[PDB]
Structure 1
Amino acid sequence: IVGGYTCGANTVPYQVSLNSGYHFCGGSLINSQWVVSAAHCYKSGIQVRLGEDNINVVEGNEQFISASKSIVHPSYNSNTLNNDIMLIKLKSAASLNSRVASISLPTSCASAGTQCLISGWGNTKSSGTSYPDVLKCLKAPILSDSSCKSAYPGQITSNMFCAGYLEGGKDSCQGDSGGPVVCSGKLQGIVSWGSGCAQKNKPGVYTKVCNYVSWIKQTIASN
């Protein structure tokens, strides 16, 4: 998160850290056994770390559950990052408590101007490379489809939204990938891509979770 603030300890209980020795991607807990992330965050063997605030220090609220089944969307294109959504199943159900909780799936898609929470342990810098220990938060609005199409001409598909600022300064960055964009209590976006971080007329593009509620709901029942 570039231009955001340090989240309060466990204020984002649905946020998980995808681990493979170190932190590489983010995700969101939607039930006791299922984490939803990004398809470009796929790798064979992921440890899902829940209840984190400081990813480099053990605090007492962490549940470390390895992935048992990593499912990528079948219609995922990695030329356009279309359908950039991934389902990860845990070994065991995670113990849902006051600081490890689930986020609701969208009952409807979110209008432009609606406010959302983007979170991650990703890069706080826009230039070289710099990673924070504590989770970072970004309050950003959903931009109209028109602004998104004009910011990335011929690039923003059906299954994409832009969330943030045309002025720049505030955006998600490298490492925030797969992370939650939660609007009005519902997971409306997954951190996908953008042109750099916090650039002018270059807001972050996010996966439309509302297009995949049936696919997720079916896949969860399936497996």
Structure 2
Amino acid sequence: IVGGYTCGANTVPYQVSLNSGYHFCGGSLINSQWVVSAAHCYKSGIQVRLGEDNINVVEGNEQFISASKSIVHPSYNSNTLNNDIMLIKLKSAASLNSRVASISLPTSCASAGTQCLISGWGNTKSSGTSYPDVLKCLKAPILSDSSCKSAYPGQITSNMFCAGYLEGGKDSCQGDSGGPVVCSGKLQGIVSWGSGCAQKNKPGVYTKVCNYVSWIKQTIASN
């Protein structure tokens, strides 16, 4: 997260860190046994870490659970990043409490102008590399479809939406990938891609979760 603020320990209870000997992606807990992340975060040997704040120090409240299976959307395209969504089933159910809780899936899509909360342990610098120890937060609005497409001509599909600031200085970044974009208590997006980080006229692009609610429910029900 570039230009954000320190969230505060466990203030984003549904935020998870995907770990393989180091933090490489974010994710969102949607129920005691399932996590939603981005398809480009796929890889073997994933350990899901819940209840985290400082990812380099065991402070308490953390729960480390191995992923039993990762399900990348069958139509995910690694070139266009269309359908950039993946479901992760936990080996064992997480213990839900005030520090570890699930986030609700949307019933309807969000409209432009809606204010959302984006969070993660990704890079905090637009020009350079600087990973934080604690969780960072950023409040950003969903942009209009016309502004999104004018910013990324011919690269925005119906399964994506832009959120952020056209002036630059505030945006999600590498490492935040797969993380949550929550608006009015609902998971509306997944950190997917963008051109650089926090560059002017280049807002972040996110997977539009409301288009996948039925797929998520049907997939979870059969696994």
TM-score surpassing 0.5? yes
Q: Distance in 2 between matches of 1:84 and 1:156?
A: 12
Residue 45 of structure 1: how far off its partner (Å) = 1.8
TM-score scaled by length of structure 2: 0.99
Residue 127 of structure 1: how far off its partner (Å) = 0.9
3-state SS of paired residue (1:45): coil
1:152-191 superposed matches below 5 A: 152-191=152-191
Q: Distance in 2 between matches of 1:55 and 1:3?
A: 20
Residue 204 of structure 1: how far off its partner (Å) = 0.2
Residue 44 of structure 1: how far off its partner (Å) = 1.1
Summarize deviations over 1:158-200 as a string: whole Å, max 9, x none: 1001010000100001100000000010000000000000001
Q: Distance in 2 between matches of 1:162 and 1:11?
A: 25
Q: Distance in 1 between matches of 2:78 and 2:147?
A: 23
Residue 99 of structure 1: how far off its partner (Å) = 0.7
3-state SS of paired residue (1:220): helix
Residue 202 of structure 1: how far off its partner (Å) = 0.3
3-state SS of paired residue (1:218): helix
In structure 1, the residue matched to 2:115 is: 115
Summarize deviations over 1:65-115 as a string: whole Å, max 9, x none: 000010000010011100000000001110000010000001100000000
Flag structure 2 segments of 5+ consecutive residues without an equivalent.
none
Summarize deviations over 1:102-137 as a string: whole Å, max 9, x none: 000011000000000000000000111110001000
Q: Distance in 1 between matches of 2:68 and 2:187?
A: 23
Q: Distance in 1 between matches of 2:146 and 2:184?
A: 22
* Matched-pair identity in %: 100
Residue 64 of structure 1: how far off its partner (Å) = 0.2
3-state SS of paired residue (2:40): helix
Q: Distance in 1 between matches of 2:44 and 2:136?
A: 27
For the aligned residue pairs, the C-alpha RMSD in angstroms reads 0.4
Q: Distance in 1 between matches of 2:141 and 2:54?
A: 26
Residue 219 of structure 1: how far off its partner (Å) = 0.5
3-state SS of paired residue (1:125): coil
Residue 2 of structure 1: how far off its partner (Å) = 0.3
TM-score scaled by length of structure 1: 0.99
Q: Distance in 2 between matches of 1:166 and 1:173?
A: 15
Q: Distance in 1 between matches of 2:147 and 2:106?
A: 22
3-state SS of paired residue (2:125): coil
Q: Distance in 1 between matches of 2:168 and 2:132?
A: 20
Flag structure 1 segments of 5+ consecutive residues without an equivalent.
none
Task: Return structure 1 stretches of 4+ with deviation > 3 angstroms.
Answer: none
